[PDB]
């Protein structure tokens, strides 16, 4: 539900939703979008729809289809290196979706911006060390870069307080033109458990396994952990409900 409101944040400032105990129907979400690129690594794209995990992590942001190439473990550009890197250790699906007209309250950020470069200029003479984002890490240059970058190419720098470490955590930002429909990117990072799994598809039983439409037949029953075999019937209530 919180995914369907407000202005979704830019790529380097992706919000997170961690689900450690619930039942998920993903197609009940993807039906609400017009899915465009469903690419998954270390688990099949269909397999991410029905199997139980230990924790399901979902990240969402605004990412145009113009540069779907940058967002994967393949690229060496700035999207996967200074903006958003997802763990290669555990399974990972990546959806690149689109908002439809008939959907409401998904408001439009003015433009898609990303951190082009993030370096540190040492407190010594002129030595430079790039900053490479580890597993999700919010890209430590995120302090200077505002939520959205203003112009085509900008330049944000700060001076770390002396020791630590005298090095200008310099950063730059670059934007891309607006598209008529908000084009979003989602990343699911599921990881299994030792022997406990607590997020599973919501599987509902049908009227075959229903007490009604079976009155008068000898049936097996399993009600809230009490199992046996018998015949159910309709009668006036007794005992405490």
């Amino acid at each position: 539900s919180p995914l369907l409101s407000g202005t979704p944040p830019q790529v380097y400032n992706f919000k997170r939703l961690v689900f450690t105990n619930c039942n998920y129907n993903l197609t009940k979400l993807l039906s609400l979008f017009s899915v465009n690129d469903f690419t998954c690594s270390q688990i099949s794209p269909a397999a991410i729809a029905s199997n139980c995990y230990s924790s399901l992590i979902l990240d969402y942001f605004s990412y145009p289809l113009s540069m779907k190439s940058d967002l994967s473990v393949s690229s060496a550009g700035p999207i996967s290196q200074f903006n958003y890197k997802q763990s290669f250790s555990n399974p990972t699906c990546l959806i690149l979706a689109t908002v439809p007209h008939n959907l409401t309250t998904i408001t439009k950020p003015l433009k898609y911006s990303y951190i082009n470069k993030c370096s540190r200029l040492l407190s010594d003479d002129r030595t430079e060390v790039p900053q490479l984002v580890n597993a999700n890490q919010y890209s430590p240059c995120v302090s200077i870069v505002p939520s959205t970058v203003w112009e085509d190419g900008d330049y944000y720098r700060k001076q770390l307080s002396p020791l630590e470490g005298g090095g200008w955590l310099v950063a730059s930002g670059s934007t891309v033109a607006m598209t008529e429909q908000l084009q979003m990117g989602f990343g699911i990072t599921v990881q299994y458990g030792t022997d406990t799994n607590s997020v599973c598809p919501k599987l509902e039983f049908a009227n075959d396994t229903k007490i009604a439409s079976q009155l008068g037949n000898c049936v097996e029953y399993s009600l809230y952990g009490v199992s046996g075999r018998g015949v159910f019937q309709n009668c006036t209530a007794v005992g405490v409900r």
Partner: antibody
Amino acid sequence: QVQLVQSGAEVKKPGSSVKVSCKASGGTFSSYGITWVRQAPGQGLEWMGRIIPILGISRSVQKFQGRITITADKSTSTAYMDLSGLTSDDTAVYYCAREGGSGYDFFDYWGQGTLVTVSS
Amino acid sequence: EIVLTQSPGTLSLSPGERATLSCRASQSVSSSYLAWYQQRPGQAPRLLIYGASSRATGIPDRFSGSGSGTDFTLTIGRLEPEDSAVYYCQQYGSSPWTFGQGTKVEIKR
């Protein structure tokens, strides 16, 4: 407090190329852009472009786009423009000046200036 | 892109007289995103005011800076003969950063 020392009056021909070289006396291009600023003779300053050798990024005004390349050699710490494809109307004194970042792009210390004179 | 007006231009004022320089903006700019510069006869312009309020490190505080939103005023409380120069108000507020037409101060001794 870094003094900025530039180059010297290129006389070129209408349809040529000028590499104006602004030198960062000190050895130190820190987190500091060089922004270039025209001034036609007896007229008022404009903007032409900006670079950061720390990141190699460059940006140019719309009018001068497709004719100007602003580069810098961070190691030897010396910045240059190269206004290729220039007409006779660009005969002006060109300054190089130190940026400050995003919300503080006021031009602190300036270069002496290098008058390009372009007519055959 | 913001075309901008300046002061009347050439000004004749005796030493010890306050001087006011105007900088109206045709398009709205941020309340504090304009910088007043001074260039001497034959030299490179030196920063006088940044942000339309703060003063450049090592600039005598006769050169007061004020104004917000549309009109920005540079007021020189006292005038010496070493103030004869051209002053430009640059709005680093929009894009591209537009320098002012420029005003010329002539100290009338």
